[PDB]
Amino acid sequence: NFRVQPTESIVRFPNITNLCPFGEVFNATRFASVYAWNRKRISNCVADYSVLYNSASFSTFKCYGVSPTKLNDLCFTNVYADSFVIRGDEVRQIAPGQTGKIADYNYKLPDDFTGCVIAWNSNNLDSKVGGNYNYLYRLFRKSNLKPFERDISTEIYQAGSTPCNGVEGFNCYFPLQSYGFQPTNGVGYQPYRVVVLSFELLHAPATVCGPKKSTNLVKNKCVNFNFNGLTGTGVLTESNKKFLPFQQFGRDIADTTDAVRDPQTLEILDITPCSFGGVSVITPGTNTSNQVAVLYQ
Amino acid sequence: ERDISTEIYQAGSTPCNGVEGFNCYFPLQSYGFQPTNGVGYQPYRVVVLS
Amino acid sequence: QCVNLTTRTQLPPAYTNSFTRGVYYPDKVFRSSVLHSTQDLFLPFFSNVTWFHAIHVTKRFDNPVLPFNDGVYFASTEKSNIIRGWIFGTTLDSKTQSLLIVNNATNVVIKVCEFQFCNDPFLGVYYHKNNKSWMESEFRVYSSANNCTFEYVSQPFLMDLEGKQGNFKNLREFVFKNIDGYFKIYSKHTPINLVRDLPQGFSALEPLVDLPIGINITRFQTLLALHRSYLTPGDSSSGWTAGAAAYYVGYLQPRTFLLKYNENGTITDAVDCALDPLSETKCTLKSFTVEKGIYQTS
């Protein structure tokens, strides 16, 4: 057979890439506490986690579960972004499969959590000298907090059974203390803006998946191309006829697919392979002639 | 085939391979066989005869 | 808010016939001079569908909650834009994610939230006396909203808010399909000029957009509108008006249709394969010029 193998493989699915508002939540004014995290819905946009891993601006980008370069290919349904400020040593507690005080009584995470936890150092975003009397946290609780559940209850923890008149005293501890965020401290009691991404997968179509790389424009080449699922190998020649301004593909009289519209330029292009026939040989006897002749069909 | 490569795996940025650093995990993980575990976490001597 | 209406005298609906209606493009692929047979939800020709009316000339204001079926061909002949939007859901009581696609004069708001729907929602248009204008003020659509899953603001579309008593001039063809949780809208506008029944023109509806809301739609209701005047007090009791609008409600059925394409990719003829014995023979033979000779059916 006389076939021509393709040399290039252009892939072009999108036309206008819009990055998700990731810098708005990161470079915001202020957040909240760990027991009352703010849930923000981030969807209807093309995510791109590759611009944040190579930025070299985060303090701890270690993510559990999957690899940091493999989550860009996996598609999700709805991504929830929760932000809270904690201490320096409390960053490792916010991880799937951990237990202690913050991950058991403040914000509990599931064991099989798909998303990871990222954070960065902050010394001017919400830090001040002289102490800190704004951020709070939870200490004890009657029952364990379920994952993905906010806590805004300011009740008094009843440890024992002695009557304390609802005030802090004997067997009546207050699980709402203030943090000691100070820039002159060591590895502990330091404000750290932690943002956890919740990766959820449902039956809804993908809309928050990673980016889709697109190649450059090229025509009049007998190479392979994948135009919106249509995998064809042929010469992308011009077309004098036009299609309707709502279609995408196009058939012909042979009940086959051979015409696709360019999604980057809205130009009708026909598909024409460069493989016709095989190789024919002509031998007018071996004992009478030692010369052959290649024949093309 | 057989390979006994004990190098550091590089994932994304920050190259390793000796220099270590961030995002540089050890591929060779320890099993941790203990008699106090279950039957599924016990070592099994598998002999394959080809 | 929720302002119910007073029990009034209504009129029984009529029964009209369809003349080649409910035909749209089954796929977004260009075709030319090809005859293919696919399985798509279409409308059977020469069928008796329900004919609803809403003319004030009396006090006709009917809007029942019919169960939503697989494919609904909504053909409304409005000359002054009386029907605003439509509602979709199952119970409609601030318990499930109901779909609300309203077409107000201000803009196109498509919100899929848990809207508390009243017993009989409508739209109130107040008539000002200081200036000859018609602006909408009463928004008795939903009581309140809680959580939301999809909110989109499209381009502003200006509509008419002056109810008249003339003949129809514009035809708004709409098709609502909820298959596998996906809502498909087929919007197509075409000016007409008639007073009753359906036009004999061919149906060629284009798909608008496909929003994967992923909800369960069971019942639906057509939201109408009401107008005010200086001669009436303006209360939502009995002293108001509703103009004149007649919309056709047709349910689609899974029938095999033979689509015909010309040299421009525009469907000009649709031959049904499950209606008349003469039309069933052309679908099997894949032709349109039946001459002499005996043929086989099934």
Residues 156-215 of A with CB under 8 A from C: 203-205, 207
Query: C168 is written with which tokens?
Result: 């129809």
Find the closest chain C residue to A247 by CA distance.
C28
> Would you say A59 and A120 are in contact if contact means Cβ atoms under 8 Å apart?
yes
DSSP string, chain C: -------------EEEE-SS-S-B-SSSEE--S-EEEEEEEE--SS-EEEEEE------------PBP-S-EEEEEE-SS-----EEEESS-SSSS--EEEEE-SS-EEEEEE-----SS---EEEE-SSSS-EEEEE-TT-S----EEEEEE------------S---EEEEEEEEEETTEEEE--EEEE---SSS---SPP-B----EE-------EEEE---EE--SSS---SSSS-B----EEEEEE-EEEEEEEEE-SSS-EEEEEESSS-HHHHHHHHHT-S---SS-----
| Element holding A238 (H helix, E strand) | strand A230-238
Nearest Cα of chain C lies from the Cα of A40 at a distance, in angstroms, of 13
CA–CA distances in Å: residue A208 to residues A2, A20, A204, A205, C240: 45, 9, 11, 9, 49
Distance, in Å, from the CA atom of A197 to the CA atom of A94, rounded to the nearest integer, reads 12
Chains C and B share 3 or more Cβ pairs within 8 Å: no
- The answer to whether the Cβ–Cβ distance between A253 and C207 falls below 8 Å is no
- Angle among Cα A212, A214, A218 to the nearest 5 degrees reads 160
Q: Which of C83, C80, C81 is nearest to C101 (CA)?
A: C83
Distance, in Å, from the CA atom of A26 to the CA atom of A29, rounded to the nearest integer, reads 9
The DSSP call for residue A156 is: P
Q: Which residues pair with C111 in a beta bridge?
A: C100, C151
- The answer to whether the Cβ–Cβ distance between A62 and B23 falls below 8 Å is yes
Nearest Cα of chain B lies from the Cα of A118 at a distance, in angstroms, of 13
Distance, in Å, from the CA atom of A231 to the CA atom of A138, rounded to the nearest integer, reads 56
Strands (E), A140-229: 157-158, 172-173, 176-178, 192-200, 222-227
- The answer to whether the Cβ–Cβ distance between A68 and B22 falls below 8 Å is no
Chain A residues whose beta carbon lies within 8 Å of the beta carbon of residue B12: 53-54, 67-69
**Coil, helix or strand for A185?**
coil
DSSP string, C37-88: EEEEEE--SS-EEEEEE------------PBP-S-EEEEEE-SS-----EEE
Distance, in Å, from the CA atom of A48 to the CA atom of A31, rounded to the nearest integer, reads 23
Nearest Cα of chain A lies from the Cα of C186 at a distance, in angstroms, of 12
Cβ-nearest to A259 among C30, C214, C266: C30
Q: Long-range pairs for A149-156 at CB < 8 Å and ≥24 separation?
A: A150/A36, A150/A37, A150/A39, A151/A35, A151/A36, A151/A106, A152/A36
Cited resolution, angstroms: 5.9
Q: How far apart are the first and last CA of chain A?
A: 11
Q: What are phi and psi for residue C278, nearest 5 degrees?
A: -75, -40
Query: A296 is written with which tokens?
Result: 């093309």
> Would you say A179 and A66 are in contact if contact means Cβ atoms under 8 Å apart?
no
Q: In whole angstroms, how large is the CA radius of gyration of chain B? A: 16
Distance, in Å, from the CA atom of C239 to the CA atom of C228, rounded to the nearest integer, reads 9
| Element holding A23 (H helix, E strand) | helix A22-26
Q: Which of C37, C16, C39 is nearest to C282 (CA)?
A: C37
Distance, in Å, from the CA atom of C28 to the CA atom of A249, rounded to the nearest integer, reads 7
Show which subunits contact B, needing at least 3 CB pairs below 8 angstroms: A
The b/e string for A137-152 (b: 16+ C-beta within 10 A; e otherwise) is: bbeebeeebeeeeebe
Residues 1-50 of B with CB under 8 A from A: 11-13, 22-23
- The answer to whether the Cβ–Cβ distance between B11 and A68 falls below 8 Å is yes
Nearest Cα of chain A lies from the Cα of C36 at a distance, in angstroms, of 9
**Coil, helix or strand for A102?**
helix
Distance, in Å, from the CA atom of C269 to the CA atom of C93, rounded to the nearest integer, reads 44
Distance, in Å, from the CA atom of A186 to the CA atom of C48, rounded to the nearest integer, reads 82
Q: What are phi and psi for residue C17, nearest 5 degrees?
A: -115, 150
Biggest CA–CA distance in chain B, Å, is 43
> Would you say C12 and C53 are in contact if contact means Cβ atoms under 8 Å apart?
no
Query: A186 is written with which tokens?
Result: 């060591």
> Would you say A138 and A35 are in contact if contact means Cβ atoms under 8 Å apart?
yes
**Other Cβ atoms within 10 Å of A136 Cβ, number:** 17
Mapping DSSP onto H, E and C, the string for C74-95 reads EEEECCCCCCCCEEEECCCCCC
> Would you say C156 and C71 are in contact if contact means Cβ atoms under 8 Å apart?
no
